[PDB]
Amino acid sequence: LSTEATAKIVSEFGRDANDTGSTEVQVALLTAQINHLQGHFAEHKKDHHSRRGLLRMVSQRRKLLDYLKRKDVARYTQLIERLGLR
RNA sequence: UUGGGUAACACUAACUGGAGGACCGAACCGACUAAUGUUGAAAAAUUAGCGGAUGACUUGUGGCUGGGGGUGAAAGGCCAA
């Protein structure tokens, strides 16, 4: 993931200016990495060690969403709708 | 295929679909048990009872391979009683 590719995905999801670590921002980056990693699975079926990597990643995202939906259900439906998870 | 659960793997339910030298059975094939017949209707036939059924299947016509040769899922079976 390129620098600008990361900085841009953080800005488009950033709640406000200078928003680096937020529920929607975090999950955004994780989702991205997950996508690239999942696509990395379509190929290299043998790469088992990487499978564990995404497991932790997706687990983190699952917990982040669980926290969000639990607190603000509105920000949740919005986040998912924008990304495309679930 | 749809729905649901899962990160994925894959799972569950419903629906769809319907293969299978598969099963019971028609064309049909086979033909175990008895009597009739046995100068018989018949040089192996009749009757009751009895077994099997989309395939490497069955069948018409045409054509090929021949004598100690051929042909034979072989029984020394068949090559016009």
UniProtKB/Swiss-Prot annotation:
Part of the 30S ribosomal subunit. Forms a bridge to the 50S subunit in the 70S ribosome, contacting the 23S rRNA. NCBIfam families: S15_bact. PANTHER family: RIBOSOMAL PROTEIN S15, BACTERIAL AND ORGANELLAR, SMALL RIBOSOMAL SUBUNIT PROTEIN US15M. It comes from the Bacteria. CDD domains: Ribosomal_S15p_S13e. One of its GO terms (cellular component) is cytosolic small ribosomal subunit. Signal peptide: none annotated. GO terms for biological process: cytoplasmic translation; regulation of translation; ribosomal small subunit assembly; translation. Pfam families: Ribosomal_S15. The lineage of its organism: Bacteria, Pseudomonadati, Pseudomonadota, Gammaproteobacteria, Enterobacterales. InterPro entries: Ribosomal_uS15, Ribosomal_uS15_bac-type, uS15_NS1_RNA-bd_sf. One of the primary rRNA binding proteins, it binds directly to 16S rRNA where it helps nucleate assembly of the platform of the 30S subunit by binding and bridging several RNA helices of the 16S rRNA. Binds to its own mRNA, stabilizing it 5-UTR and preventing its translation. Induction: Part of the metY operon that extends to pnp, also has its own promoter. This is Small ribosomal subunit protein uS15. Keywords: Ribonucleoprotein, Ribosomal protein, RNA-binding, rRNA-binding, Translation regulation. One of its GO terms (molecular function) is structural constituent of ribosome. Belongs to the universal ribosomal protein uS15 family.
